[PDB]
Ligand binder design. Sequence first.
Ligand SMILES: *[C@@H]1O[C@H](CO)[C@@H](O)[C@H](O)[C@H]1NC(C)=O
Ligand SMILES: *[C@@H]1O[C@H](CO)[C@@H](O)[C@H](O)[C@H]1NC(C)=O
Ligand SMILES: *[C@@H]1O[C@H](CO)[C@@H](O)[C@H](O)[C@H]1NC(C)=O
Ligand SMILES: *[C@@H]1O[C@H](CO)[C@@H](O)[C@H](O)[C@H]1NC(C)=O
Ligand SMILES: *[C@@H]1O[C@H](CO)[C@@H](O)[C@H](O)[C@H]1NC(C)=O
Ligand SMILES: *[C@@H]1O[C@H](CO)[C@@H](O)[C@H](O)[C@H]1NC(C)=O
Lengths: 98, 49
Amino acid sequence: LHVLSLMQNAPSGIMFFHYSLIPNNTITVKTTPGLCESDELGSKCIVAKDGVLVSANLSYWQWSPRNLYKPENLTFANVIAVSRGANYTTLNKTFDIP
Amino acid sequence: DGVLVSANLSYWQWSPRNLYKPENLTFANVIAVSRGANYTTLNKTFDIP
Ligand SMILES: *[C@@H]1O[C@H](CO)[C@@H](O)[C@H](O)[C@H]1NC(C)=O
Ligand SMILES: *[C@@H]1O[C@H](CO)[C@@H](O)[C@H](O)[C@H]1NC(C)=O
Ligand SMILES: *[C@@H]1O[C@H](CO)[C@@H](O)[C@H](O)[C@H]1NC(C)=O
Ligand SMILES: *[C@@H]1O[C@H](CO)[C@@H](O)[C@H](O)[C@H]1NC(C)=O
Ligand SMILES: *[C@@H]1O[C@H](CO)[C@@H](O)[C@H](O)[C@H]1NC(C)=O
Ligand SMILES: *[C@@H]1O[C@H](CO)[C@@H](O)[C@H](O)[C@H]1NC(C)=O
């Protein structure tokens, strides 16, 4: 993951300072594309806004960015409501978000 | 996640971006948005809730 890259001069050349983000501590979680409450085609279903839906082997689903795990309770802000496009995961309970 | 398509046919269908497997458009494969560019008026109401 690329952050910033400066360049400096050098003898007979040029040398780049590529700053990056190698990750080191993985944590294994569960990840859906999105959550449904109803089995019916045409149900109210949701997907994450600029992130991935995540559960750390936990009873309910959460929000986390695409490349790093800072889990958050999913709200209206970080959730896009769309469709039954792929097979999203039915969690068999109604929403906690207006 | 696809393109709207008609094989010189009376009504429009859904197909992926790079391959032609036409499907009747449903609620699943259709996003409702706006009158942004000049989309095509088909002069009939929808068949999808
Ligand atoms: C989640 O469950 C998997 C099952 O294989 C386990 O290996 C892993 O340690 C668990 N991770 C967390 C964060 O609970
Ligand atoms: C997230 O929601 C759970 C209940 O669903 C609550 O117990 C917890 O305090 C909330 N906040 C976190 C994990 O920061
Ligand atoms: C609850 O979830 C199970 C599997 O996750 C599946 O049978 C269906 O989505 C739901 N079942 C019922 C009876 O609502
Ligand atoms: C569609 O119409 C065009 C008109 O030029 C024709 O050339 C083409 O063969 C037709 N294709 C199909 C699949 O009907
Ligand atoms: C798609 O809809 C048409 C009518 O609009 C129907 O005749 C046809 O059987 C449907 N299914 C297909 C093409 O698989
Ligand atoms: C029906 O479509 C035609 C051309 O596609 C255009 O005049 C307009 O979009 C519609 N006309 C009427 C009278 O609704």
